[PDB]
Each structure stands twice: as C-alpha cells, then as structure tokens.
Short mmCIF file of C-alpha atoms and ligand atoms in Angstrom, two decimals:
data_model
loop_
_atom_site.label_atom_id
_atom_site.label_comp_id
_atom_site.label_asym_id
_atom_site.label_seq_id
_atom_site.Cartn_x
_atom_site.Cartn_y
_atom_site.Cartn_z
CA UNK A 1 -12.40 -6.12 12.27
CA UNK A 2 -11.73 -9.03 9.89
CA UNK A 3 -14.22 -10.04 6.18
CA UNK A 4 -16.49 -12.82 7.32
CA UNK A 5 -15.30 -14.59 3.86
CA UNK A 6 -11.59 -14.58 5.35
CA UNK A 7 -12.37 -15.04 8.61
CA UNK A 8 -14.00 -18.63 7.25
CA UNK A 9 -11.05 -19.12 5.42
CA UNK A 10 -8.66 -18.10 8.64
CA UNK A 11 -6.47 -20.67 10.14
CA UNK A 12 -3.98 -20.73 13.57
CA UNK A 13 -1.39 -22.13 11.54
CA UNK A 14 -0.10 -22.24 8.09
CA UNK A 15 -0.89 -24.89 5.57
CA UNK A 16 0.05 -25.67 1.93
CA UNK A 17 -1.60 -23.42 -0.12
CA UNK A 18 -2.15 -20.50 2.47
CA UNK A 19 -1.00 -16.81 3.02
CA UNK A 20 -0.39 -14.76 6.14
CA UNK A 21 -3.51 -12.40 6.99
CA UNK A 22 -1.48 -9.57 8.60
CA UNK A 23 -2.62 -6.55 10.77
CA UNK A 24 0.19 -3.93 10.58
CA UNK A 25 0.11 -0.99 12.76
CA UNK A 26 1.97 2.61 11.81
CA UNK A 27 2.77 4.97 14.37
CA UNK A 28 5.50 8.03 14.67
CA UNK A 29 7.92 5.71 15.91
CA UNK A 30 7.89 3.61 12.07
CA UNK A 31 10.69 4.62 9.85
CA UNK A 32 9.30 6.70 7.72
CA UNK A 33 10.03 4.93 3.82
CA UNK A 34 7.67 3.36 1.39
CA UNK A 35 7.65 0.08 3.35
CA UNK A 36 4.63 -1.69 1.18
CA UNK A 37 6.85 -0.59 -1.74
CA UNK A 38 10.21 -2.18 -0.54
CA UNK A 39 9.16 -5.43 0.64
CA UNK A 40 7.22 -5.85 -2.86
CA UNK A 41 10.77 -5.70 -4.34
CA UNK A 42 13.02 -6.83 -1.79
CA UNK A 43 10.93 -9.98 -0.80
CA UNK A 44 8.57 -10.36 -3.99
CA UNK A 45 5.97 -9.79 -2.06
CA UNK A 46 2.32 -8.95 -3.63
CA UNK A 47 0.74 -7.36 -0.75
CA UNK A 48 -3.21 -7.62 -0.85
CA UNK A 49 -4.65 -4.67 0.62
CA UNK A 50 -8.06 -5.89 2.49
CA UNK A 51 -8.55 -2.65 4.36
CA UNK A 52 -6.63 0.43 5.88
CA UNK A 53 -7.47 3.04 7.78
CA UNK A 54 -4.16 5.36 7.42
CA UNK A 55 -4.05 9.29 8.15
CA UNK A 56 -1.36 11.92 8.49
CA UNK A 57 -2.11 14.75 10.86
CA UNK A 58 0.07 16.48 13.02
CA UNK A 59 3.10 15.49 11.26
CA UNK A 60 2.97 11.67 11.66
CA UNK A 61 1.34 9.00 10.14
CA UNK A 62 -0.82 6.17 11.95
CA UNK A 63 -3.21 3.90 11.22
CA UNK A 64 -3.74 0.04 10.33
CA UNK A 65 -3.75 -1.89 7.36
CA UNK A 66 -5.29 -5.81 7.10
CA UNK A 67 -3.46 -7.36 4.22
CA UNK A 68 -2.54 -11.02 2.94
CA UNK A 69 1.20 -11.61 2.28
CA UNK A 70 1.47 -13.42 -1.08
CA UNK A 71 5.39 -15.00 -1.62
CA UNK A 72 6.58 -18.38 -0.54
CA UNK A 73 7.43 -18.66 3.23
CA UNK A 74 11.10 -17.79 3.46
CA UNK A 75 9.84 -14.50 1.82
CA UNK A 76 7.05 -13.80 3.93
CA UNK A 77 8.98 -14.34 7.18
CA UNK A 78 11.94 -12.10 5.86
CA UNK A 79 9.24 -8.91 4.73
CA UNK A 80 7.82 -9.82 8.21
CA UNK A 81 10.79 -9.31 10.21
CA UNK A 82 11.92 -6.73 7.67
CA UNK A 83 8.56 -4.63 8.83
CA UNK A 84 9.29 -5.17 12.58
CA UNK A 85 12.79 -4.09 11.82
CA UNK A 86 11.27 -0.91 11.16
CA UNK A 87 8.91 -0.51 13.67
CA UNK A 88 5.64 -1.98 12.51
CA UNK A 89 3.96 -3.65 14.40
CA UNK A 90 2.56 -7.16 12.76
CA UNK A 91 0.14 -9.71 14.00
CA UNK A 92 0.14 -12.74 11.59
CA UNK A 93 -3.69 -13.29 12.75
CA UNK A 94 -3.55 -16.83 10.55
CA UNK A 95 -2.93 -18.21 7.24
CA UNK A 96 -5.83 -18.09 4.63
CA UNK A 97 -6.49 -20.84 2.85
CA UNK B 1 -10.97 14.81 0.49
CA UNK B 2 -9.16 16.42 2.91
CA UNK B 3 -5.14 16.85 2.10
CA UNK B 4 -2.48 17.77 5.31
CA UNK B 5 -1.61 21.50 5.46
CA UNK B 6 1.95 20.61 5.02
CA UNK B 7 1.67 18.87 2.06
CA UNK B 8 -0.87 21.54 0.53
CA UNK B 9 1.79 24.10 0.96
CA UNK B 10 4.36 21.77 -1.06
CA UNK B 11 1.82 21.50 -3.45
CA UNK B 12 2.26 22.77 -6.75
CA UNK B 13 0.19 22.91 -10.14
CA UNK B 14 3.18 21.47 -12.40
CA UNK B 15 6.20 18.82 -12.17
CA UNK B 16 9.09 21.16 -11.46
CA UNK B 17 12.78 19.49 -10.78
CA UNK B 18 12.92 17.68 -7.98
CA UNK B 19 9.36 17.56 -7.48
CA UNK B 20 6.79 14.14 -6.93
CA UNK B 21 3.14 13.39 -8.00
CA UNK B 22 0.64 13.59 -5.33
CA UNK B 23 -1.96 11.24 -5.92
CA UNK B 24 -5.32 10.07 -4.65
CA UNK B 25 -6.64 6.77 -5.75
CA UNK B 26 -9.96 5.67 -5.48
CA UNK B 27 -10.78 1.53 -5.73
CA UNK B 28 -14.23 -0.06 -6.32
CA UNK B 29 -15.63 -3.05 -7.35
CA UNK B 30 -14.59 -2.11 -10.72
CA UNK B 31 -10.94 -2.12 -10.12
CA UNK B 32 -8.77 -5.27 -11.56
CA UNK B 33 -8.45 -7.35 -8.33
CA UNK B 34 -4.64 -7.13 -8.08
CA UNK B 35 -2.18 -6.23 -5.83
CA UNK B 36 -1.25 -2.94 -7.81
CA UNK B 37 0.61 -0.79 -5.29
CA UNK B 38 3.01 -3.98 -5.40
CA UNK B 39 2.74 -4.40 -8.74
CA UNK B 40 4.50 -0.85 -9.64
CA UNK B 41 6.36 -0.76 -6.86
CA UNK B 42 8.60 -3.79 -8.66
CA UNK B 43 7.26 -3.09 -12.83
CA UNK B 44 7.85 0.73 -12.74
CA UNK B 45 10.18 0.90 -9.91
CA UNK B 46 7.93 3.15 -8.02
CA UNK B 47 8.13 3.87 -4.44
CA UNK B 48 4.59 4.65 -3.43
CA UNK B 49 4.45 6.75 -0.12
CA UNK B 50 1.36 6.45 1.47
CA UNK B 51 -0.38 9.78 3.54
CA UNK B 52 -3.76 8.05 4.16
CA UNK B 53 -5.85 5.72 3.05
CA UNK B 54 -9.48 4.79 4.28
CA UNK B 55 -9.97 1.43 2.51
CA UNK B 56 -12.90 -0.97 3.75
CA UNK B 57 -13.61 -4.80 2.45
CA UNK B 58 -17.03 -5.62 2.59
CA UNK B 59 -19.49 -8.03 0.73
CA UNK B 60 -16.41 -9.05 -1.26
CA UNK B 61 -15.23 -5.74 -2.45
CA UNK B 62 -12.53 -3.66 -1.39
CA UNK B 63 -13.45 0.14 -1.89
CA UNK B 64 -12.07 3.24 -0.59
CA UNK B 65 -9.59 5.57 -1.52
CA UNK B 66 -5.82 6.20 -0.97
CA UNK B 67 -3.32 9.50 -0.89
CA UNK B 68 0.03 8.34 -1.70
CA UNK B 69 3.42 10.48 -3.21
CA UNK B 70 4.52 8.36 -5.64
CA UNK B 71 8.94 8.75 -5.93
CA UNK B 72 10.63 7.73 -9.30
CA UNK B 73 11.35 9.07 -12.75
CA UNK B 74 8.73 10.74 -14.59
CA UNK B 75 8.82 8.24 -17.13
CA UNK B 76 8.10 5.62 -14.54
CA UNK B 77 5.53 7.32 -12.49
CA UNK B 78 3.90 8.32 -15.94
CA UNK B 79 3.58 4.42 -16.97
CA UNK B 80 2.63 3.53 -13.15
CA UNK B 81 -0.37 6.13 -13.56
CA UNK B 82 -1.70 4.82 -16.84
CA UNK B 83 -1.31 1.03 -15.26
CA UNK B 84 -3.04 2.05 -12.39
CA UNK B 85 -5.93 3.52 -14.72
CA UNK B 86 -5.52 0.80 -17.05
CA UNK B 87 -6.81 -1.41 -14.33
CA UNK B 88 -10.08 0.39 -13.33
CA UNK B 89 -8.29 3.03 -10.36
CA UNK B 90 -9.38 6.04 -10.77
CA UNK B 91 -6.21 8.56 -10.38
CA UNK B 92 -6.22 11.95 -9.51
CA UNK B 93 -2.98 13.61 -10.05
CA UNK B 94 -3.26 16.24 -6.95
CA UNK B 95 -0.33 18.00 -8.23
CA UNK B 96 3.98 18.24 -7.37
CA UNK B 97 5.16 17.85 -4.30
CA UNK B 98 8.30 20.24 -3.86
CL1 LIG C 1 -3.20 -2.37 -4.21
#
C-alpha cells in the first residue's frame, strides 16, 4: 500500500535529489523509546509521515508506518541502521525523486 | 477514539509531578505540510511516544489521527502543543499520564 503520486516518483536506487521511502514495522520485540523522536535529533532527520497504522493492545505496540527520510545520506543510513539496531524492521522500498 | 485500559487507568485530569500529557492529534488537509513530530522532537526537545496512530495518504493528503505521550518539561511540551496547533493539528490534551 504505497500513494500512486510516490509510487510515480519511486525509484530502485537513489539519485541526487531523492529520499528513502521507508516501510518500518513495530512489533513487541522493538525497544520500546520514542524512536521517530531520537533519530530526528540524533541524525537530523525530518521524518515525513505518509501513513501509519499503529495500535497498542495487549501491552505491546505494532503496526507500520510509510515515511520518507529527509537528511543527507550518511544520515539516513545511520537513523536506518540506528532503527534496525532496535528492532525495526525497515524496507528502503526506493528513493523518491 | 478508543484509549488502552492501561493507560486510562494512568490517566489523570491534571499535570501532577512526574506526570506526561496524553495527546491525540488529528491531521487534515488543513495541517501545515511539515514534518512536525520531528520538528519538536529537536525545537522543544520533546520525545513524542507514540500508542497508535491510524494515518492514511490519499488524493494528496495525509489525514488521520495519532495518540502519542509526549516526555519533556512542561514548558517544552506547553510550546510543542501550541506549535503543533499553530500549524493547523488539532490537539486534544487527553490528560496526565502518572
Ligand atoms: Cl508529523
């Protein structure tokens, strides 16, 4: 489930002037911290929310979240890696140009 | 509109020490189009902790609405709130979170 206007704008690989379209998946095995929050400092990333679908029941919180990393790409890789670190799981689905 | 039983029995009226803001936030095509959670996360040095969120992108709007605690000083989460409305969210302060 990805916008029709990004999806036009999706490509494999990444290009001057484009952005990683990520789809990050929660589950009770991420750390639980303000992840979106840390990166945004640690990384100066501006993450662009596109669509999530996030709940907490149970005591856990799951979900997805479709965003588009904005920083330059030593940043983007690091906040990337930084996420995995912490059990989400990211697929860079392509760089929108 | 629904809010975990957990959290509803943390849930207080008023900011008490040691307490946090629960917040739901609701975005439409009305809403700046800006990254804001990032945006406070680094201005007001907020860490936004997010409960749910059922956000949706369609016909070049994002819309939808978020629960999030939002951890900091009450000066900072104070400002973040007014930024936040400032730029066309609509904030509901649910209550504390003890
Ligand atoms: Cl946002």
């Amino acid at each position: 489930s990805i916008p029709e206007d990004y999806q036009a704008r999706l490509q494999p690989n990444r290009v001057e002037g484009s952005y990683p379209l990520v789809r990050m998946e929660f589950t009770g095995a991420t750390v639980d911290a303000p992840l979106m929050s840390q990166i945004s400092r640690k990384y100066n990333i501006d993450v662009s929310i596109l669509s999530s679908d996030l709940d907490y029941a149970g005591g856990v919180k799951f979900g997805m979240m479709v965003a588009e990393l904005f920083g330059n790409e030593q940043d983007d890789s690091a906040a990337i890696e930084y996420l995995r670190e912490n059990n989400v799981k990211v697929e860079v689905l392509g760089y929108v140009l």
